[PDB]
Write a protein that binds this DNA or RNA. Structure first.
Lengths: 151, 224, 206, 99, 127
RNA sequence: CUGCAUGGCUGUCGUCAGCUCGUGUUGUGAAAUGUUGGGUUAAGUCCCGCAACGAGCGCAACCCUUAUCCUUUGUUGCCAG
């Protein structure tokens, strides 16, 4: 990206709900190009989350994502022999991506029996803004507010 | 050409007062509207006298190099030049065309090899890049050297549109003793010019007049 | 860096194969070795016959050698004699019956192989390498080469430190697949070892 | 019955020239001919190390394409049989006949 | 007379024969459900019947070989649209905008000497 | 045995954008300019500018393959009616 700027591939929407957002999610959860088996785990987790937690499947997703979404972050930088930490205000599209990514990662780093149950309980926890993924947003802010001086 | 005949084309129009070169005091009628007005009393006899010597030169099989690289007039100089079986330079003059002719001559050989090969040698079997890449080279050489491609030697005279714009070509001529005939506008330096023709050197209507006149007298001088 | 063999890269494009017979895997190896043994035999016996190139093809149960030579009378010998004696031993080496064809090399100074051999033989005679090269170039151009270069490598003039040197007149676009580039090789076995000669000749395009 | 000729060669322009010869000859000698059909090209390949010692990543990648043609001749009219059967064909073409 | 469209993708190639009447689909003598165990892929063959409307309007009789699941479903997608355009060709502007007219040209990239795959490079040790 | 006497082959910086010549011009001269600049290109790519005008090798093109289609040919491939 020295010279060549680019657009971004605009992936197809989630097959079940027609959501580009959930397509960004299944892909992020996907491993070894196992798309078939990835969306299976995302839905069953949404189905587990939907059925027994007040429904509104897309909305349930947002309530949880709303909570792990980070408004600002820090970008490392090396000036006069010094590695300064510059807090940057982060753009909406990626805001979702980090939010989704930390939810997925916290789910695999969990004790429950399957990825679907884990994913479901991560969303639930995030929905109540608690657990690992939310905590990942908070460290980002503690780390950001600290270097507030250099913005 | 006639005083009446010239006036219509606007040969009499010159540059502003602010841009004049003082050496050209004799040939300025005066000025109006902060613009210099050239003297057509002075222009015509001097111009006719230019045509005579050109007519003489052409009648001993003399080679005439038309020079005028203004973008606006580049085409007109070509047609003017070809209409009398002579040679031209109609895009950026390469410094040393005359003084370094032996080296620039090689580029002429290159030109011919290229258009000859692309036609009689034909190729058209290429690699797909060479079609344009060789045309690229040929395209360039054509603008640069299309007009003198068959000149063979050093010209016997130069006819120049705008002495300041073409100061390089006029300077090479000077060094080689080649006589220079030039349209020399109020802002320019007439010192390099053996036969100074003072009039507008921009306006396509004015340019074509001298040039149209020049190419015509070559043919008369040729027709003998 | 390393350059691609300019004869090889152009095979199928503007350069012909020198072996052009067909054969299945069964006998492809045997045919290819038989080719080697005949080319070798002929290349020795005709060393002083300016043989620049040997084409071999194998129609049905036959083999026919074409000897491209700048000295056909030599190769042929008085009333077919030398042709004939070559035939009878090619046929031995080949196994199958054999026929020999002879193609004149009209202008050998444009033939890279005979250029390279000519310089090779000249280094063995004790000619100076700059001369031999420069005679080759000059000759090649006055006869209408679009370009030529000849390289010489290793221990020029018996120098202790081995050197590589080339001369080049005109035009030699080696990256142009279209370009008729005639390329070949020769080794000069000298009193102080081996001097390799490479030669390129550009003859126009398509 | 029918006579079918399988043609194989390493060079394409040369193979269908040999094919063309045969078909035309047949068509002129009043034989009826199915084909020529292009049967799939079997291209062997070879990858060889390019250096005399070590440098395992430095290689040449060669291939030999073997071209295939099927010439099917419906009526075996003897004039046709003699027409074909002393044709002068490119040496580097292998010709197979089925009977 | 049948209205036809060829479609292909990766190493697959699908032939697609259109005729009016119904919402019937028979790939390789088999049913749409039977042939594709994945229901998402089922949706892509249906797609060319979205912007262009079939409910019980035309029969598509199709077949395919080569490639895999999504290759065969992509290829059939492609071939239908061509058979739709065959039927009118006005329809296209819709199909263009859909992305369905295009022949997705992305083939698997060859494996290269000195590399572990088409691009994956042998791990590099500094010492 | 010597790759520190060699040929041929190969790695490598690196498919990086470089390397040069004639004539001209500048400097007593080694040399310079061209190929010092402003933009832009994958690129000494291209364009303006320019005491340089031009040209050659390398860049690109011509080559193989892949993506759409047309004509030819249907067996051992194909099966719409």
């Amino acid at each position: 990206p020295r010279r060549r700027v680019i657009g971004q591939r605009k992936i197809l929407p989630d097959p079940k709900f027609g959501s580009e957002l959930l397509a960004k999610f299944v892909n992020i959860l996907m491993v070894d190009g196992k798309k078939s088996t990835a969306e299976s785990i995302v839905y069953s987790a949404l189905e587990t989350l939907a059925q027994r937690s007040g429904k509104s499947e897309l909305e349930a997703f947002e309530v949880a994502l709303e909570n792990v979404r980070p408004t600002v972050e820090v970008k490392s930088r090396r000036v006069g022999g010094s590695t300064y930490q510059v807090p940057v205000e982060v753009r909406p599209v990626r805001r979702n991506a980090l939010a989704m990514r930390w939810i997925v990662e916290a789910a695999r780093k969990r004790g429950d029996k399957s990825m679907a149950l884990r994913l479901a309980n991560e969303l639930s926890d995030a929905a109540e803004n608690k657990g690992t993924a939310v905590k990942k947003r908070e460290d980002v802010h503690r780390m950001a507010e600290a270097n507030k001086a250099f913005a | 050409v006639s005083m009446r005949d010239m006036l219509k084309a606007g040969v009499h129009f010159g540059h502003q007062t602010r841009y004049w070169n003082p050496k050209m005091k004799p040939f300025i009628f005066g000025a109006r509207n902060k613009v210099h007005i050239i003297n057509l009393e002075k222009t015509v006899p001097m111009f006719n006298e230019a045509l005579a010597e050109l007519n003489k030169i052409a009648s001993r099989k003399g080679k005439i190099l038309f020079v005028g690289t203004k973008r606006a007039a580049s085409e007109a100089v070509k047609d003017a030049a070809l209409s009398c079986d002579q040679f031209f330079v109609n895009h950026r003059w390469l410094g040393g065309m005359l003084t370094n002719w032996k080296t620039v001559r090689q580029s002429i050989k290159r030109l011919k090899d290229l258009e000859t090969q692309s036609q009689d040698g034909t190729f058209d079997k290429l690699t797909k890049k060479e079609a344009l890449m060789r045309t690229r080279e040929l395209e360039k050489l054509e603008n640069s050297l299309g007009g003198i491609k068959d000149m063979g030697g050093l010209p016997d005279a130069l006819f120049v549109i705008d002495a300041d714009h073409e100061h390089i070509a006029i300077k090479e001529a000077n060094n080689l003793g080649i006589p220079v005939f030039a349209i020399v506008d109020t802002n320019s330096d007439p010192d390099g010019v053996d036969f100074v023709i003072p009039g507008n050197d921009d306006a396509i209507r004015a340019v074509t007049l001298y040039l149209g006149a020049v190419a015509a007298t070559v043919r008369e001088g040729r027709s003998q | 860096g390393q350059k691609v063999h300019p004869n090889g890269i152009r095979l199928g494009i503007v350069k012909p194969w020198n072996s052009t017979w067909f054969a299945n895997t069964k006998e492809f190896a045997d045919n290819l070795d038989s080719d080697f043994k005949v080319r070798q035999y002929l290349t020795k016996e005709l060393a002083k016959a300016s043989v620049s190139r040997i084409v071999i093809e194998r129609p049905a149960k036959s083999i026919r050698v074409t000897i491209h030579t700048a000295r056909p009378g030599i190769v042929i010998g008085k009333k077919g004699e030398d042709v004939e004696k070559l035939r009878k031993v090619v046929a031995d080496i080949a196994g199958v019956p054999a026929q020999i064809n002879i193609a004149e090399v009209r202008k050998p100074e444009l033939d890279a192989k005979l250029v390279a051999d000519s310089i090779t033989s000249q280094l063995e005679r004790r000619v100076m390498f700059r001369r031999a090269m420069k005679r080759a170039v000059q000759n090649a151009m006055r006869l209408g080469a679009k370009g030529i270069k000849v390289e010489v490598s290793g221990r020029l003039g018996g120098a202790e430190i081995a050197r590589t040197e080339w001369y080049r007149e005109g035009r030699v676009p080696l990256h142009t697949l279209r370009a008729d580039i005639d390329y070949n090789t020769s080794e000069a076995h000298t009193t102080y070892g081996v001097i390799g000669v490479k030669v390129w000749i550009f003859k126009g395009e398509i | 019955q029918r006579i079918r000729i399988r043609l194989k060669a390493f060079d394409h322009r040369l193979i269908d020239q040999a094919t063309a010869e045969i078909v035309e000859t047949a068509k002129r000698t009043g034989a009826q001919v199915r084909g020529p059909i292009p049967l799939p090209t079997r291209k062997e390949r070879f990858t060889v190390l390019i250096s005399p010692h070590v440098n395992k990543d430095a290689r040449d990648q060669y291939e030999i394409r073997t071209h295939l043609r099927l010439v099917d001749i419906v009526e075996p009219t003897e004039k046709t049989v003699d027409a074909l059967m002393r044709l002068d064909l490119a040496a580097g073409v292998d010709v197979q006949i089925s009977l | 007379n049948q209205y036809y469209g060829t479609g292909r993708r990766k190493s697959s190639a699908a032939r697609v024969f259109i005729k009016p009447g119904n919402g019937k689909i028979v790939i390789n003598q088999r049913s749409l459900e039977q042939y594709f165990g994945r229901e998402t892929a089922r949706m892509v063959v249906r797609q060319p019947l979205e912007l262009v409307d079939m409910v019980e309007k035309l029969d598509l009789y199709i077949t395919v070989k080569g490639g895999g699941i999504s290759g065969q479903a992509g290829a059939i997608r492609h071939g239908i649209t061509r058979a739709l355009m065959e039927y009118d060709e006005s329809l296209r502007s819709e199909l263009r905008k859909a992305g369905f007219v295009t022949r997705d040209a992305r083939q698997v990239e060859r494996k290269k000497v000195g590399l572990r795959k088409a691009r994956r490079r042998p791990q590099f040790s500094k010492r």
